[PDB]
Amino acid sequence: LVQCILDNTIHGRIDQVNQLLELDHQKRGGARYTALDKWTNQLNSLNQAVVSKLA
Amino acid sequence: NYVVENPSLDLEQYAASYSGLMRIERLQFIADHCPTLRVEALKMALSFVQRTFNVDMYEEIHRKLSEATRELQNAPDPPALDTAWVEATRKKALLKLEKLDTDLKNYKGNSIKESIRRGHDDLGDHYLDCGDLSNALKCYSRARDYCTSAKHVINMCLNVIKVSVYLQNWSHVLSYVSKAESTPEITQAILTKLKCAAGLAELAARKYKQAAKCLLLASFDHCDFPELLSPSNVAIYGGLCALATFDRQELQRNVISSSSFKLFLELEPQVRDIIFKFYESKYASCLKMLDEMKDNLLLDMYLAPHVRTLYTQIRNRALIQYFSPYVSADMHRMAAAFNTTVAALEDELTQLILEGLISARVDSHSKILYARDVDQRSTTFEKSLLMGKEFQRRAKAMMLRAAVLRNQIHVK
């Protein structure tokens, strides 16, 4: 199981305490809020730098 | 720093594998950094330094051997240099050098570029044997001018690379490696020697990612390369740097695809097991072999400072990969995945979380390491609110600036 996860064939981790294999179901359907946040922060820092340089 | 005490080095093989001034430098550092074995290391060093008419470093080595022998004469309660060598060595060294100099200067009156280049290279080789670094460089730096063919350029690059390693002018090595590689249209494996020199120079220049990449491209067909670095240390140099920088999939591809590092790993089965244990998540056996590799290779020339940083990186990377496929990772089991204690791992884990790239939370109650999977949206909203607050503050600042500039408010 460890080898399979490290090969990116398994989307999940292992609970060795309880002898359990928890797999990430990745049902959130996101990965777009991350792009929105990156865009927001990058362009707002961009605007702040532009305003500071122009002032 | 270094100069630690540890036994079991094989002096005969390490001295015989290398040859030249590189061997002379290797014997001196090994003697200087490995006590309780410095005498035989110095005795073998001086026995080889007197060959090829050395002058200045001989006095330093003879003085060190004289001190070492004097120390041996007081513990279980100094050799003569035979200064007849000085009379003999100087008289022979001068006469042959003057004869060679007379020929080259006459050849300079004959005006042949290749002959001038070849003679200057011979003068540089003699000066290096005599123990004259800068003198060889100027001879080599006059041979660089009179080049005619691509092979002449390659020989010119190799000589400058060899000298600048002793001079520790690694910038000149890297510049000549780039010149020798990029220029002539990127059985005689010439690029392999250049890649080996670049990897050693980069590693001595505190570089690991590019040095391992260059070392992995080195073909084993080069075989005998004792003027710079032995194949045994080359495999070790590549393996340690690859383990510290190359990730799992990066490691697996590069080692297998090269097919020459597999031969290199055959030369050093210890690092081969270390990499294999690293792949199979057996870091307990991986690191205990690493500590065994620590003492045997911390008395190495260009490794001793860098190996400690490399080993520290290896320990960090091993911990990161181990915890990655774990949700409720028991810190007892993670501690049991090495010879470390529970408290020591907890301190190491806490340091890794502070630095980062482990993304975990420590539950000291049951001593279980729980991975952190924060909601993207909550963090996004928090930092967006912070950005809005900062934007409002900066807007207030700009409005105040405009107000004070419009009203001409300034200290006179």
Side-chain angles (χ1 to χ4, degrees):
Chain A
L1 282 175
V2 163
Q3 292 180 3
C4 290
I5 301 180
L6 287 173
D7 294 330
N8 298 270
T9 61
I10 292 186
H11 298 265
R13 302 163 189 166
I14 304 178
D15 182 9
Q16 198 178 13
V17 184
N18 305 328
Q19 301 292 338
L20 171 57
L21 179 66
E22 297 182 2
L23 299 202
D24 196 329
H25 204 259
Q26 63 183 357
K27 75 196 76 63
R28 79 286 184 273
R32 182 251 184 176
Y33 299 96
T34 305
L36 286 190
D37 173 52
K38 290 180 181 179
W39 154 85
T40 293
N41 290 264
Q42 289 295 334
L43 298 197
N44 282 277
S45 59
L46 195 147
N47 164 53
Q48 292 173 358
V50 165
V51 170
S52 64
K53 290 183 178 181
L54 289 181
Chain B
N1 224 348
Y2 346 97
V3 204
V4 300
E5 283 93 15
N6 47 355
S8 67
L9 293 91
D10 185 11
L11 300 178
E12 288 80 9
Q13 185 68 21
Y14 275 84
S17 62
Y18 298 77
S19 181
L21 168 64
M22 174 59 60
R23 177 194 298 194
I24 297 173
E25 292 175 352
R26 289 196 64 94
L27 291 182
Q28 179 184 181
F29 184 97
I30 285 179
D32 295 331
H33 287 56
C34 180
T36 75
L37 289 172
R38 182 176 297 186
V39 187
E40 304 292 336
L42 278 180
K43 283 175 58 181
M44 293 178 182
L46 197 69
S47 66
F48 192 77
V49 168
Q50 49 182 353
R51 305 165 219 185
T52 74
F53 42 92
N54 191 358
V55 293
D56 192 10
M57 303 291 105
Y58 190 104
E59 299 179 0
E60 187 72 20
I61 296 301
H62 166 64
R63 182 185 62 88
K64 292 185 177 182
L65 183 58
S66 301
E67 294 178 0
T69 307
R70 189 63 178 182
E71 290 179 1
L72 293 175
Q73 291 286 352
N74 307 328
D77 286 355
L81 74 164
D82 299 80
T83 191
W85 82 277
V86 165
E87 316 314 291
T89 305
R90 294 306 304 115
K91 74 174 180 62
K92 307 154 195 174
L94 292 154
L95 289 171
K96 323 299 170 283
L97 180 58
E98 300 328 299
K99 286 164 210 146
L100 284 187
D101 289 343
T102 299
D103 302 337
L104 192 49
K105 299 297 184 290
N106 292 348
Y107 300 154
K108 293 189 179 305
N110 296 317
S111 297
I112 294 145
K113 289 175 67 176
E114 169 49 51
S115 295
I116 288 177
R117 183 188 70 87
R118 182 173 302 275
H120 261 296
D121 287 326
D122 299 330
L123 262 65
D125 293 329
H126 199 260
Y127 274 128
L128 277 178
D129 298 330
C130 294
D132 291 330
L133 300 173
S134 69
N135 283 255
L137 179 147
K138 296 184 292 293
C139 296
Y140 291 138
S141 85
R142 274 314 284 198
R144 65 176 174 83
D145 293 14
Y146 297 85
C147 46
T148 303
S149 181
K151 51 180 180 180
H152 308 169
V153 178
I154 290 179
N155 299 329
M156 169 211 64
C157 290
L158 287 177
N159 297 329
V160 175
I161 289 159
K162 168 190 175 182
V163 176
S164 306
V165 175
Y166 310 128
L167 291 173
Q168 303 181 357
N169 282 82
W170 316 95
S171 57
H172 292 70
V173 167
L174 301 177
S175 303
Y176 272 78
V177 175
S178 57
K179 180 180 180 180
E181 288 178 1
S182 59
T183 299
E185 296 186 2
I186 47 183
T187 306
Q188 298 290 337
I190 311 180
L191 302 179
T192 62
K193 308 296 186 176
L194 301 169
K195 290 299 180 180
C196 291
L200 178 55
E202 294 288 343
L203 192 145
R206 181 212 46 72
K207 320 274 201 313
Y208 323 107
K209 43 167 190 54
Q210 187 69 22
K213 184 178 181 180
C214 293
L215 286 178
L216 283 165
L217 298 180
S219 180
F220 194 64
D221 307 334
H222 75 280
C223 298
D224 203 8
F225 191 57
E227 58 257 37
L228 272 300
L229 205 61
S230 67
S232 60
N233 291 88
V234 159
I236 290 174
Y237 273 27
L240 294 183
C241 289
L243 203 72
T245 54
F246 286 60
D247 54 76
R248 165 194 205 74
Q249 59 87 30
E250 206 179 3
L251 276 168
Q252 187 250 347
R253 299 177 300 108
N254 280 258
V255 176
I256 297 314
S257 48
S258 165
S259 294
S260 65
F261 208 89
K262 313 293 311 164
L263 281 148
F264 273 121
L265 284 185
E266 286 321 292
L267 261 63
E268 293 301 294
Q270 313 95 1
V271 296
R272 189 202 53 224
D273 302 337
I274 284 157
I275 298 160
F276 284 173
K277 289 154 183 298
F278 182 76
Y279 184 81
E280 292 181 353
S281 300
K282 301 187 317 283
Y283 313 100
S285 60
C286 177
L287 299 181
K288 77 193 280 313
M289 294 295 110
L290 196 71
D291 308 321
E292 285 159 48
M293 293 299 104
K294 180 64 182 294
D295 66 1
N296 302 143
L297 293 139
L298 96 108
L299 307 173
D300 213 347
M301 320 303 126
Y302 318 114
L303 199 57
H306 319 267
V307 68
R308 187 178 179 181
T309 302
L310 281 161
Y311 274 28
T312 318
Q313 185 60 254
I314 285 155
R315 271 53 161 272
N316 304 328
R317 179 175 303 263
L319 290 195
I320 295 169
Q321 289 190 355
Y322 185 48
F323 177 64
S324 298
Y326 279 137
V327 289
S328 177
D330 216 332
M331 297 178 62
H332 294 79
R333 302 173 182 268
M334 194 172 189
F338 186 46
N339 292 318
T340 187
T341 62
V342 182
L345 179 79
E346 178 177 340
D347 301 331
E348 289 181 1
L349 288 173
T350 301
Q351 184 69 22
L352 287 188
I353 305 172
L354 287 176
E355 303 323 289
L357 291 175
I358 189 63
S359 161
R361 303 294 180 274
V362 170
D363 196 323
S364 59
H365 192 189
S366 58
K367 301 296 183 178
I368 301 179
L369 186 55
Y370 293 93
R372 173 56 90 230
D373 189 0
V374 69
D375 168 50
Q376 173 64 51
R377 172 179 169 178
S378 298
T379 306
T380 290
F381 267 79
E382 174 186 359
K383 64 197 290 184
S384 300
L385 184 59
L386 294 180
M387 167 271 312
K389 200 173 189 181
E390 292 290 336
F391 170 78
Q392 291 186 4
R393 192 181 68 90
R394 284 183 172 85
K396 298 167 186 299
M398 181 58 208
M399 291 189 294
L400 289 183
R401 184 74 177 188
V404 306
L405 287 180
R406 174 188 58 180
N407 303 285
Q408 296 291 336
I409 307 305
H410 59 275
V411 183
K412 300 181 179 180

